[PDB]
């Protein structure tokens, strides 16, 4: 079936994740095969300045995804 996984990643991190203008955030979902997203850059959560990235695909693939999109921070 499918799952989603939200991880929390600091705003001054987040460049790590997207690479190239999304060139790296554009390769891990190509992989994976996972659409992979992240929250509106004015957006964090609660009580702190991590924006939200959003993994949603089969839980096998969101688990490599996961794993690579948090290798680079």
């Known amino acids: 079936?499918?799952?989603v996984v939200e991880i929390a990643v600091p705003e001054n991190l987040v460049g790590?994740?997207?690479?190239?203008?999304?060139?790296t955030l554009v390769e891990y979902q190509?992989?994976?095969g996972?659409?992979?997203q992240i929250s509106k850059k004015g957006e964090f959560l609660p009580g702190t300045r991590n924006r939200k990235v959003t993994i949603t695909g089969t839980p096998a693939a969101t688990q490599a995804a996961?794993?690579?999109i948090t290798q680079r921070i």
């Open 16 to 23: 790590a994740i997207l690479g190239k203008g999304g060139k």
């Open 30 to 32: 190509e992989l994976t």
């Open 1 to 3: 079936m499918k799952d």
């Open 34 to 36: 996972c659409r992979i």
């Open 66 to 68: 996961q794993y690579l």
